[PDB]
Amino acid sequence: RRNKMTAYITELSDMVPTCSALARKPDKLTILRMAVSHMKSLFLTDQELKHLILEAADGFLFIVSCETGRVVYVSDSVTPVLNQPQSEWFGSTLYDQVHPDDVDKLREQLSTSENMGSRRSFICRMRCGHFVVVHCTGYIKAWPKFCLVAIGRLQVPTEFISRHNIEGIFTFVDHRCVATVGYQPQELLGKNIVEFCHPEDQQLLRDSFQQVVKLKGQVLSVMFRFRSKTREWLWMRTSSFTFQNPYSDEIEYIICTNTNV
Amino acid sequence: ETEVFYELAHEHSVSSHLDKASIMRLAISFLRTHKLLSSVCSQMDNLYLKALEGFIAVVTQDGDMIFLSENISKFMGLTQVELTGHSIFDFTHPCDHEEIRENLTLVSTERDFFMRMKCTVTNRGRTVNLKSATWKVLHCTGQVRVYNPLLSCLIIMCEPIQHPSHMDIPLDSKTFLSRHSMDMKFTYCDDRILELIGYHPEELLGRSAYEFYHALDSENMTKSHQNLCTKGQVVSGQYRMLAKHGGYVWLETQGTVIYNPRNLQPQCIMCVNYVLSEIEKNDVVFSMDQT
Numbered sequence: 001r002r003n004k005m006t007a008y009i010t011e012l013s014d015m016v017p018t019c020s021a022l023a024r025k026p027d028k029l030t031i032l033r034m035a036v037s038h039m040k041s042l043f044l045t046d047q048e049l050k051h052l053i054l055e056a057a058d059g060f061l062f063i064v065s066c067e068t069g070r071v072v073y074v075s076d077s078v079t080p081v082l083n084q085p086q087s088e089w090f091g092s093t094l095y096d097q098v099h100p101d102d103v104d105k106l107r108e109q110l111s112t113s114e115n116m117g118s119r120r121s122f123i124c125r126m127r128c129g130h131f132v133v134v135h136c137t138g139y140i141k142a143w144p145k146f147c148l149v150a151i152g153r154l155q156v157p158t159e160f161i162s163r164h165n166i167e168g169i170f171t172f173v174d175h176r177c178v179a180t181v182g183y184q185p186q187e188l189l190g191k192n193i194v195e196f197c198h199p200e201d202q203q204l205l206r207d208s209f210q211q212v213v214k215l216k217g218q219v220l221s222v223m224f225r226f227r228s229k230t231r232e233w234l235w236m237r238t239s240s241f242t243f244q245n246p247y248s249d250e251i252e253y254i255i256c257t258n259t260n261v
Numbered sequence: 262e263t264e265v266f267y268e269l270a271h272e273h274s275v276s277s278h279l280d281k282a283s284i285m286r287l288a289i290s291f292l293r294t295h296k297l298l299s300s301v302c303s304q305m306d307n308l309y310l311k312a313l314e315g316f317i318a319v320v321t322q323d324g325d326m327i328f329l330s331e332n333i334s335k336f337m338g339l340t341q342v343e344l345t346g347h348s349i350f351d352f353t354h355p356c357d358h359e360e361i362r363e364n365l366t367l368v369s370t371e372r373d374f375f376m377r378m379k380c381t382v383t384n385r386g387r388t389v390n391l392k393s394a395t396w397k398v399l400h401c402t403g404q405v406r407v408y409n410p411l412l413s414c415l416i417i418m419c420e421p422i423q424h425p426s427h428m429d430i431p432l433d434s435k436t437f438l439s440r441h442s443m444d445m446k447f448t449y450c451d452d453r454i455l456e457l458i459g460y461h462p463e464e465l466l467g468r469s470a471y472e473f474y475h476a477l478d479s480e481n482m483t484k485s486h487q488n489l490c491t492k493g494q495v496v497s498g499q500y501r502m503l504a505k506h507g508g509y510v511w512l513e514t515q516g517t518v519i520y521n522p523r524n525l526q527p528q529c530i531m532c533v534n535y536v537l538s539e540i541e542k543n544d545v546v547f548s549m550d551q552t
């Protein structure tokens with residue numbers, strides 16, 4: 001157990017080039033005095049923690065007035081997060097730097113009616129370069145009237161997708177179907193997919209639907225002729241698989257990617 | 262004498278007296294941190310860490326928490342001095358360890374995950390001892406860096422997920438709560454959903470949340486549910502909920518597993534849902550429900 005304190009001192013010496021600048025470790029008491037000089041020589045530094053936070057979360061700090069939203073201060077990390085000079089931010093109001101439909105959440109959070117040192121945590125869309133989603137956490141400090149001090153961090157047609165009940169009725173269609181089959185989504189939803197299938201190919205697709213269910217979780221790809229809105233049989237590669245609830249495993253829907261072949 | 266063991270100026274009414282390994286571990290850790298900070302870099306040291314809703318952690322490839330921000334206490338109870346220089350694995354849930362190990366390795370450097378860490382603070386805001394160690398889920402987002410036999414570091418920001426029962430943070434008009442069963446079916450939802458997404462709560466009760474997910478999102482949303490059940494809390498990614506009469510709204514959700522405290526059993530999943538957008542593509546009909 002004495003190793004711990006010994007490794008500690010060899011580790012300490014191994015952390016400084018002026019402790020590798022001797023033939024050997026000085027007296028253990030002398031080693032403690034030797035390091036005290038180095039530690040005092042030079043991690044509370046503002047500039048270090050700002051970069052730690054930009055490293056970790058890709059976020060910047062800013063202070064705006066609660067009454068007007070004017071940015072009394074913005075740190076220089078706004079340029080790497082949002083590609084916006086402090087020129088644009090400083091001497092402006094956060095309202096003109098966020099999405100028009102977010103100014104309301106913005107005033108709500110900027111309110112001082114009920115909450116001073118109160119916390120704040122919201123999400124908004126800030127203009128860049130287009131808007132980016134920004135998580136904002138902060139508090140409210142006296143202006144010297146009121147001011148939000150806050151951190152904002154950044155964070156991460158050939159076919160059409162459909163969802164079906166096991167019967168085969170479209171319960172979901174994405175907007176791309178108008179360019180692949182010509183139907184408006186509402187013309188497909190509520191109807192069965194076999195309705196738009198050429199009668200010759202109808203048993204093929206009908207068989208795939210049972211198979212995908214028995215072949216639970218797994219993809220199979222049937223190929224049939226699809227009736228367009230413009231009425232022309234279009235070959236269609238439908239790759240389907242089962243989706244099931246991650247708790248009860250009850251089948252939630254069949255998911256199909258209809259690709260014109 | 263050993264008065265130099267009362268005399269190390271470590272970054273001062275706490276640099277004076279420290280016990281056993283506290284003086285040394287802190288010092289070695291500080292110098293290693295400075296070594297990394299040189300690699301990254303190129304007054305207001307109190308605003309930055311009082312705005313954060315989490316703490317900053319620099320953890321090496323071995324697993325050493327060579328740097329922990331001063332605020333870890335407000336969220337974890339355990340002090341920066343109790344933990345700096347100690348191994349991440351001695352204060353995290355063991356069944357999370359392997360995940361932490363693959364997030365410490367090496368080539369995208371971005372990291373986003375959820376860990377469970379020991380916590381000796383309590384809901385009221387009063388601290389407790391280490392035998393009284395609860396598990397708190399932290400959303401960890403950061404970068405792994407190579408720095409100098411090159412070393413390797415994980416600079417993460419670790420945020421707690423507010424418990425739906427207890428929260429002193431302003432609730433927005435764009436945030437609404439929903440309760441769900443383990444079958445992901447709504448068992449309750451807020452009155453505001455109608456004003457924001459257009460649906461009355463009555464017509465969602467009994468409907469699984471998979472009915473309303475935009476088809477492009479629902480698998481990324483199962484993975485988030487499979488991590489909320491494994492770990493008890495989660496933050497979702499941005500997702501689309503189909504609106505009542507065409508369209509979709511953007512949402513982010515903090516999920517929490519709620520335990521019946523009499524039988525110690527999973528009763529429901531409470532979800533705090535954040536509306537990020539207005540109805541988008543209301544002209545477009547996606548679902549049979551919205552017709």
Ligand SMILES: CS(=O)(=O)c1ccc(Oc2cc(F)cc(C#N)c2)c2c1[C@H](O)[C@H](F)[C@@H]2F
Nearest residue numbers: 441445470473474485486497502514516534
């Ligand atoms: C993954 S999550 O953030 O916790 C989540 C996020 C949203 C959840 O349900 C919701 C709640 C809501 F307001 C809109 C939608 C949609 N679309 C789904 C659910 C969850 C959980 O799955 C819980 F089981 C439930 F399924």
